[model samples]
Target: HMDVVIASSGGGWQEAQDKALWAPAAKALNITYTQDTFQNWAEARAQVESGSVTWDIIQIGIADEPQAKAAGVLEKLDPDIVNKADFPPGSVTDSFVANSNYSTLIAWNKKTYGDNGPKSMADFFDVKKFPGKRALWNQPIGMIEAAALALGTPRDKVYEFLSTEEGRKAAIAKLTELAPSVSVWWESGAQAAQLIKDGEVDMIITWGGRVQGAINDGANFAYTFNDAQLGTDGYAIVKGAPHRDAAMRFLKEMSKAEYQKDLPNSFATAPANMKAYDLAKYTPEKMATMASAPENVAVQYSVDPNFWAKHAKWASEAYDNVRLSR
Candidate 1:
């Protein structure tokens, strides 16, 4: 009786969402669904601003939510329709709803460190204590946050401090200190996985999935959650979507714990719904590697996507300035 068009980045992430959310939601709502590749924010803005919003829903990084909302390209999520009681903080926002949680953690070649590896974010920067080549993501959010944590910014105060110029300078300086040891500043998840699988560096700061995917492919590496930066990836409705009501209903069904629980089987990420863990069928070994597992989540700090929404442009430039200086 209804139809909704959904967009995803495609590949494993798209496949994961199809199985865990899209397919199920479509069937349950008895609606026909069309799929499209989610390209970039500029495209999303173009559709909305042109009054030809073809997409009903789109998967996006949580950090992009605030910007989308500010640009009036995204619609407000109905709290009454989408259950949030079981979702973690920062997973639900006025314009976004998270589907999965992931982390940027320190992973190292097991052969390089063996039983003794970098135990914390601070150790990732301490060349003497854990001396070896390192790698970091080319982006800023994860790297900047880890550098701030390494420089003694308390977990709870990280975003607040980063909001200030002094704090930004300190974090950049800390990362600059480790530049000599950094062998690469990876630009994509694929590159990161390849680096780990090929044992390109002794240690790296990358998304858990990139590292886990490599490990599953026989990369002898280990990662720690200690002081990791956690974030989410989720969906948003484009403003003036063609099927607004149906999109809202679909989101409601998609957010259910039963559906969210199956996400990990498809992607190397954790569910945004905390209660999904209760319904999860993962083995202890699998659970141990997840970013949102209780123990791991406890040791890591959640990066505020809202903070990045406002600062991403300048923060990225600042990060590149220091990274390129070396």
Candidate 2:
């Protein structure tokens, strides 16, 4: 009965299409749906800041969620409508709920590593033990988390410790130590996958989905879930959404167990719903590769969006200084 617009950049459109076009249509919701992409963060931020928000729902990363909510571009979520209890604890916040969790993991050429390849973030930093061309992200999220892990912070305490001044310096020092061997600091998932395919770097930090896609296409690449940095992409409803009710319904449908189970097969990423892993589509090996896997989930750390928001300016400055010096 309402027209729903879902806007996303990157792979977020898959979830919107899955719910609006695939699930709701089957359930016979009399709503019209549209999907649009805004690849540029500047343009998306401009639209939201100007109060000309056209999309009913927007998919945002943790880095942008706090800012968007603080700027009043997003609406506080209604758990009654969205069923927050069905998702992982803390995955649903005031203005956003996790759409899917992904990690920036170290991937290697299976052939290159053989049996003695790097296993954890610690191994990633021990260039003397496992020497090869290495690659890490240029962004703070992955690089900082990986560096913190290499510096001996436990997964659970990573974010808390990194908020300290000493922790920040240690993370930078770790990255500086590894910089000489880094051949590529890829900007996109596609580029990361290509780097692996071309053997440009023996190992790189990248998303699981991109690695899966490359493997599916017969690329000789594999990733470890050990010490991966798990971060969720969130979907938040826009304030003053024209089709508010329909948007909520769309979110509910998208979070269902069946829909989530279909995500990996359809979109090459694990689902947000934890229960979705029990489905036949999710095998033990595949789950082991996922950031959501029980063991991997325990080994990895969830990104602290609040901390990142508070320290982004300083983090950005520090990152730029490091990159420039390299």
Candidate 3:
């Protein structure tokens, strides 16, 4: 009998709890599971540093994982115990391993845009062709990458370009060009979903899960994985979690193919297991819309967590100055 407290941000863990934790824990172990909301990394860091770590396992953004590990807040993953083979090749890491792969994709109102909808990141910036209000996250990760892509930088060259001074300046300039058309800068995935549902904006660069949620609720939204920016959220064990064994066991269970297959229905995110790709639930049609589907995954460019970790302070300041000037 073990009690595990799971802390998650607003993104994917709400659905993951229903799909991954509840059933397995009830059937196999005497476990008490509780969830708490703490979306901001600053808050999470404060909690860990305060000597009152309430979470045995936490769902952390990939960008924050290195910082957490460096601060000695996260435990190094024991892959032998966690069973790395059950997951996709790149899912596991030294401190935290992926819970799900997510993407920031371009979504539009299908009814409004019709068959000649914007298809790529480049098309999103072409106001003359796809004329309407636009939505984007306020953060630099997706917006900067999208801007870089729209500026004629190839998908594979996006990160490399952004790492250089000329490319970084170009990305910022591109965003400034598109800024006038952006009506909403969504703060969270849920907010992005709501924006689409309410017709707050006709087009959005948003997380696939949020767009999918809106579509499921009968919003007239369609999303393309083309030129999408891929990111991940993952499970990390607190350095001194009371239920360390239980946390590790939970990670192992989540990595299973069967468990991974259930994740999509549970959360709007796909599992990080390759075998889950063959599951009946993941049809060719469904794969077209998924971030983890092989075809879609192939088209996406990965976000550079390390770059963000190193340059976020300066980037944030620069973004703030740009915002103030506007």
Candidate 4:
């Protein structure tokens, strides 16, 4: 029997994975599936280097894609198994297959803002006009790029500025300015949603799906796509994974049209299969908030994995030191 070990961060997205990927692959291949979790891309490299890699597949951010691949910690995907033509343009990569694309959107409590809320990165930091306790993702990956945007860096130039010593300082300084007003340094998407529901903070920068999750939990939350951070989080097969052939088989089965269409139904995540949208019957209202939605897609900039793959360590340490201790 094939046993697949998959990783995801929080429970909120797991049901979607169960309904969409894991369960179907299990039935199709007669495999048994188990789940795991990870907090760092370095874990992939560490496991492989130490020769104790128990995980077959780890869920990875776009940033993790480059870093893990560059270190030779992830398996180079078989194009025959994960065909690029079966997915949206740019979704399939040499080392990973895009599982879902979503936004790191500006989410806020509707009771606090009503009709007037933080609409853009500029508004998120302008406490003078939009004053309240706010939450930001605890990591530097998206947060640092957002800080660069708050410093008036163009959407396209966030990574360009972040590549330099000087640009990192400017972004960190702005993050410092916003730090005193922040009550929550959220580490998980579910925590970001919880804070809004509990009224612990008025605003946060979190996955767009989180706002949807909060609303489903009976919280009055809303999110905006303006200046959003968009990224595709995918599944990475560990280089020396156990059950390696089954892992490849699972990835292939999961990418098929039938399974891809199940993704958006189970979670706020949109499938990478462009054809999946054609197969599903999502309402326009439901589609309005999706990361794949055209209106949402038009206003956002893609997260730069290459930049973060290079800069995340120092940038995250600097962010944590300044935001946490001070």
Q: What local distance difference test score does each model get? A: 0.83, 0.73, 0.75, 0.81
- Candidate 1 lands at a TM-score of 0.84
Q: Give the better candidate number (2 or 3) by lDDT.
A: 3
Question: Deviation in angstroms for 317 in model 3?
Answer: 3.0
| Order of the predicted models by lDDT, top scorer first | 1, 4, 3, 2
Which parts of model 3 are misplaced by more than 4 Å?
Answer: 1-3, 11-13, 240-245, 277-281, 323-326
Order of models, best TM-score first: 4, 3, 1, 2
Say which prediction, candidate 3 or candidate 4, comes out ahead on lDDT.
4
Q: Residue 213: error of model 2 in Å? A: 1.7
TM-score for each predicted model, relative to the true structure: 0.84, 0.83, 0.87, 0.94
Colliding residue pairs in candidate 1: none
Residue by residue across 1-326, what tens digits does model 3's lDDT show? Answer: 25677777565546565556445644565556766666555565676778776678788778778667777888887756446775656556788777678888999987779767788989999998888999877666677779889998899988788889888778778878887888877777788888888877889998888888888888888888899988887788888787887877776666566666777763567667667667645767666656777788788888778877676666666555545445
* Candidate 2 per-residue C-alpha lDDT over 43-105 given as tens digits, one digit per residue, 9 for 90 to 100: 555776687767787777766677677767777777664567667777778787776788878
Q: How accurate is candidate 4 locally (lDDT)?
A: 0.81
Candidate 1 lDDT by residue in tens digits, 168-250 = 88888898888888889886677788899999899999888878888988999998888898788888999999899898889
What is the clash count for each candidate, in the order shown?
A: 0, 1, 0, 0
Best by lDDT: 1
| Error in Å for residue 200 of model 1 | 2.7
Candidate 4 residues 205-323, lDDT tens each? 88877778887888887778889988888887999998787888887887787888888784688788777778887789878878878898888888877787778778868988867
Candidate 1, residue 128: Cα displacement in angstroms equals 3.9
